[PDB]
Design a protein around this ligand. Structure first.
Ligand SMILES: OC[C@H]1N/C(=N\O)[C@H](O)[C@@H](O)[C@@H]1O
Ligand SMILES: [Ca+2]
Ligand SMILES: [Ca+2]
Length: 443
């Protein structure tokens, strides 16, 4: 048996664009995901968030499923352009109303809300003004955040500024695979820097507006292992960890500069006097959220950021991602070793598999159970070794719009039949309910 600490938080997570649908309802402005997904070629099958899980209408029934499963924390995001259709200026009361109903219902049911302020659905109106490339986004994001704090901070006490700023910056502005779909390395590093500035401004106003609250920030992480003992491969691993994982943002937040290998690689792409902003970027945070899915074997490659991945014969998910549960232990140990944050959450962990509804009307996803069990066990090991891990959130409550992969990839512990919008709790859902009941793993 592996019992967690008594106050441990077990949650499920979603994001607004992935589940809500009705992106233009009730006065909402377009987001960059609306325009990106409506551009032919950008998303598999031409899928969009126009309907998704229809959570905009079905939110009450989905919360009843959270209650049914016995889960006591729900991490969800707020759509910026539902709240401020033009990004700044006009506040849309019906956008506030939508989230107020969710928040009030969660509290009535004793489910703790964790609110992600930004999970990639930037207002299109702000992208026309450069989006994350524009230094002024620190002001725009501070404005938006203040609206949320003033409206919701009486009830919501646990907040996240940004989901995965690395992905926002690099995947959105260097690889061009996510909205706003750009390929410019100078823009991408200015986005990294503005994301830190925006985050820090939001925390600063949080201290004025939610004096009894806690605020943090969420990073994607992978477990990188070297293909050989060659110094060049060891160094390539170090680079991937400093660039792709939490240090890109936590070295600034905790130490006041970007990590060594990031500076070596990218100093020419950063704003000239970027260091002027580092004093503000050090604004104190209450917790760090780490997302974790997969591991990669890495090699130096002069033809590649000089790093290529080496495919391994390891079990994989429907995303093609290698299943390496020890990486969740490694990343937790490493965050403590490097930055010693006072509190850490696993803010996403999960897996996509090819789910089907059998004749019994059930969804038998033993592969998803095995995945979640292995990673939860490794998280438990990290706790035994002193990592201040305070909670774990499964990605996701619901099958949903998987960004550029569209609806083809199912990460839910609840299946969604998109023709009828019927929800079917998967075996992993029943499994996880039992994990919450036992406060850990029982065999
Ligand atoms: O790719 C799965 C999941 N993983 C994520 N980050 O690693 C995103 O936050 C989330 O929106 C996405 O659906
Ligand atoms: Ca109920
Ligand atoms: Ca300064």
């Amino acid at each position: 048996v592996k019992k967690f600490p008594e106050g441990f938080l077990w949650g499920v997570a979603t994001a607004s664009y992935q589940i809500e649908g009705s992106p233009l309802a009730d006065g909402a402005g377009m987001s960059i995901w609306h325009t990106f997904s409506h551009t032919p070629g950008n998303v598999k099958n031409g899928d969009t968030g126009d309907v998704a899980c229809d959570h905009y209408n079905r939110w009450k029934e989905d919360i009843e499923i959270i209650e049914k499963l016995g889960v006591k924390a729900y991490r969800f995001s707020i759509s910026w352009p539902r709240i401020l259709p033009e990004g700044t200026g006009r506040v849309n009361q019906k956008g506030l109303d939508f989230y107020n109903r969710i928040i009030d219902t969660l509290l009535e049911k004793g489910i703790t809300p964790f609110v992600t302020i930004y999970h990639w659905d930037l207002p299109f109106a702000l992208q026309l003004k450069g989006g994350w490339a524009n230094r002024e986004i620190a002001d725009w994001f501070a404005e938006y955040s203040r609206v949320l704090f003033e409206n919701f901070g009486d009830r919501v006490k646990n907040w996240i500024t940004l989901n995965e700023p690395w992905v926002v910056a690099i995947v959105g502005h260097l690889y061009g695979v996510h909205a706003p779909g750009m390929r410019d390395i100078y823009v991408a590093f200015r986005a990294v820097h503005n994301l830190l500035r925006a985050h820090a401004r939001a925390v600063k106003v949080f201290r004025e507006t939610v004096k009894d609250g806690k605020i943090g920030i969420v990073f994607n992480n992978g477990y990188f292992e070297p293909a050989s003992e060659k110094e060049e491969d060891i160094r390539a691993v170090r680079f991937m960890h400093q660039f792709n994982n939490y240090p890109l943002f936590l070295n600034p937040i905790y130490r006041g500069d970007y990590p060594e290998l990031v500076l070596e690689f990218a100093r020419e792409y950063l704003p000239e006097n970027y260091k002027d902003d580092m004093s503000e970027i050090q604004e104190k945070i209450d917790f760090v959220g780490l997302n974790y899915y997969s591991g990669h074997l890495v090699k130096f490659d002069p033809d590649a950021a000089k790093v290529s991945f080496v495919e391994r014969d390891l079990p994989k998910t429907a995303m093609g991602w290698e299943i390496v549960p020890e990486g969740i232990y490694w990343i937790l140990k490493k965050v403590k070793e490097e930055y010693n944050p006072p509190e850490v959450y696993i803010t996403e962990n999960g897996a996509a598999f090819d789910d089907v509804v059998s004749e019994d009307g059930r969804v038998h996803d033993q592969n998803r159970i095995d995945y979640l069990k292995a990673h939860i066990g490794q998280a438990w090991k990290a706790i035994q070794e002193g990592v201040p891990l305070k909670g774990y959130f499964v990605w996701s409550l619901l099958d949903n719009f998987e960004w550029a992969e569209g609806y083809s990839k199912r990460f839910g512990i609840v299946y969604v039949d998109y023709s009828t919008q019927k929800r079917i709790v998967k075996d992993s859902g029943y499994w996880y309910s039992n994990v919450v009941k036992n406060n850990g793993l029982e065999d």
